[PDB]
């Protein structure tokens, strides 16, 4: 069950109670389709049925050759603001799968696979480098061509096919056509992976025989729609009468640990005169999951997809942070973990729809309200950073933008605090910090207070030094703070 805590002090909330499906790795499978290799159609009848069959044949031919052009080029793909994204690492998503694709070209590797599938589809092949992979043959097109159309390639008259065969071949061959089309516009790498690349029945019957937990098996096969989006299909080869491509599939190595989504919104002062305001916003936005005694961190909402209570994320775009980061939802000033924040001068009305509610930052004359579908507006917001639960609320309107709130259920707790923007002195408070921490702001402050300390102590230190005596052509002596004339004493 999902709960949410809002922190009035840090203009942030946390959505707690989720579960983590974490993509930790890959498993590469080899999908294949058997293809009769036919360069020459010699049948001279003319009967519309023969004609249509020949048309589909040419479609198949051009499909093959298209795919060969695809095979020559080695496949590749490519897969900030108030977010910490810029801190992320950089990785090669399909690197694994591509290594397998290479291994397939190796002379005689194909034949290992063709010889593994004699007595049944879906079987294990170990490759020359001893990386073992599932291989599944999802289409036998060569068989149908043989058992069905063989008159039309090698005979001239060439007995006439019945129209049922025409329909059937169009049906069968279509899959190859679509797989080819996809690989064409996508330069040989597709994600998510199609129903044409793997049928639900095929992908489940793959998952089932992968080397993983029954909890993992159960987890993918419940979530197939997600599994697809985290998978790739890589065009590999077409040779020796088999088209073969690798589908690299996500290995979830961290299942059912706690996860929470941290939400952030502009904090800011209420000073009635404009431009005189100082403003502070936490930059630790996004997903957090317990992983292996640490906490992982997904700064980018694109990395994470939310099915009900499970949060599927990709560790590839993530950082792994020591657990003490959970502090800043309580003591943002706690020194054991230094929390990251941006600072600036620009007070602009913003709002952020959270899991169980909505944060609202209302600054200036902007009108901020929350309304119910029946009762109309049920709350008007003052200037500041506030929050409202999803219970009894439907819409949150801020300025001219009308936000709808998620209606999924859970308990929501408002946690009062004094807005930490108030603890800062406007004069020494830097707004030039784009990417910053709490202590780095403390540091630019300690320097801009320091040069006040030094300049004031220097100005007071020349107090204790004596001015010039008069220029009047008399000699002067020092007596209790002043100059006196020497004449006084003689």
């Amino acid at each position, epitope marked *: 069950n999902i709960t949410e805590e809002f922190y009035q002090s840090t203009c942030s909330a946390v959505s707690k109670g989720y579960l983590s499906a974490l993509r930790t790795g890959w498993y590469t499978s080899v999908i294949t389709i058997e293809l009769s290799n036919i360069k020459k159609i010699k049948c001279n009848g003319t009967d519309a049925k023969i004609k249509l069959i020949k048309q589909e044949l040419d479609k198949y031919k051009n499909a093959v050759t298209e795919l060969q052009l695809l095979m020559q080029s080695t496949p590749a793909t490519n897969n900030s603001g108030r977010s910490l994204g810029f801190l992320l690492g950089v990785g090669s998503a399909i690197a694994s799968g591509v290594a397998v694709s290479k291994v397939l070209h190796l002379e005689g590797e194909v034949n290992k696979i063709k*010889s593994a599938l004699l*007595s049944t589809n879906k*079987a*294990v092949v170990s490759l020359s480098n001893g990386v073992s992979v599932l291989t599944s043959k999802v289409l036998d097109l060569k068989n*149908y061509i*043989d058992k069905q159309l063989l008159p039309i390639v090698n005979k001239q008259s060439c007995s006439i096919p019945n129209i049922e065969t025409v329909i059937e071949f169009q049906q069968k061959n279509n899959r190859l056509l679509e797989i080819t089309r996809e690989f064409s516009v996508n330069a040989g790498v597709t994600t998510p992976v199609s129903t044409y690349m793997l049928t639900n029945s095929e992908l489940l019957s793959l998952i089932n025989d992968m080397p993983i937990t029954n909890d993992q098996k159960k987890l993918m096969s419940n979530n197939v729609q997600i599994v697809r989006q985290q998978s790739y299909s890589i065009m590999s080869i077409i040779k020796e009468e088999v088209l073969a491509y690798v589908v690299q599939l996500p290995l979830y190595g961290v299942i059912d640990t706690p996860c929470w989504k941290l939400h952030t919104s502009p904090l800011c002062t209420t000073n009635t005169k404009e431009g005189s305001n100082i403003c502070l916003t936490r930059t630790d936005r996004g997903w957090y999951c317990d992983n292996a005694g640490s906490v992982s961190f997904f700064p980018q909402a694109e990395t994470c997809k939310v099915q009900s209570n499970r949060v599927f994320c990709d560790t590839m775009n993530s950082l792994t942070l020591p657990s003490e980061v959970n502090l800043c939802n309580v003591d943002i000033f706690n020194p054991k973990y230094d929390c990251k924040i941006m600072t600036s001068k620009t007070d602009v009305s913003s709002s952020v729809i959270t899991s169980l509610g909505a944060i609202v930052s209302c600054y200036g004359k902007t009108k901020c309200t929350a309304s119910n579908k029946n009762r109309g507006i049920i709350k008007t917001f003052s200037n500041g950073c506030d929050y409202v639960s999803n219970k009894g609320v439907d819409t949150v309107s801020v300025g001219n933008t009308l936000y709808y709130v998620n209606k999924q259920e859970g308990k929501s707790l408002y946690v009062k605090g004094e807005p930490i923007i108030n603890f800062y002195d406007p004069l020494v408070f830097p707004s030039d910090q784009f990417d910053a921490s709490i202590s780095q702001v403390n540091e630019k402050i300690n320097q801009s207070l320091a040069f006040i300390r030094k300049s004031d102590e220097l100005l007071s230190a020349i107090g204790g030094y004596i001015p010039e005596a008069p220029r009047d052509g008399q000699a002067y002596v020092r007596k209790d703070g002043e100059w006196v004339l020497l004449s006084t004493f003689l």
Partner: antibody
Amino acid sequence: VQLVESGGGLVQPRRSLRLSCAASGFTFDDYTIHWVRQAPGKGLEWVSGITWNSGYIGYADSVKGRFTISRDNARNSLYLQMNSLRAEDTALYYCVRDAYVSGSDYYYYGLDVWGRGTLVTVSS
Amino acid sequence: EIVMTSSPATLSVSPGERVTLFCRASQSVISNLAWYQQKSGQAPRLLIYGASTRATGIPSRFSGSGSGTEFTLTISSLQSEDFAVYFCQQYNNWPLTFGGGTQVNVQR
């Protein structure tokens, strides 16, 4: 649906014998077929097999270049040939259909159809 | 070739009792595996295939697990005509191999 082995007998060592299998009651071409032998009071040994068009055929390491397996598909027949027949080849020889059709819409697996099997004894 | 290792040698279980037979495989056979029953003096009957799915005709006493190196055949309540020899086979690669077999003898 029947597989009927024929041509086992009593054969002297080092000499040759031919076994045939006639097929009945199912469309023969569509299936790939294996010869599987069983020594007396012993286990099952896969001898060899062919598949739908003598496209791929394969042998046990035990019988290699000694044995040869071809099919007609016309006579709806299967043939295994036994040369330099050694004395441990004696066994009941089974014609066995492989239920995995490759490319029909519903797949089956395993070895579903077995003859009574002939009986080949290599002794002097 | 990968070696099916049948086990136990023999198994003795009294009529109407669960019996369990085991098949280890040299390298991983995944699931492509089958179980055969052979009553003395006749051919194999095919019991299970895909390790998990009983062939048409087989009663629901016979049940199997699998997809790995280690595998299981389970007969729910042994009945008169179930005392026979059982063989496992994988079809993952050629050559098709088998185990040695497990005799189930009626226990006295």
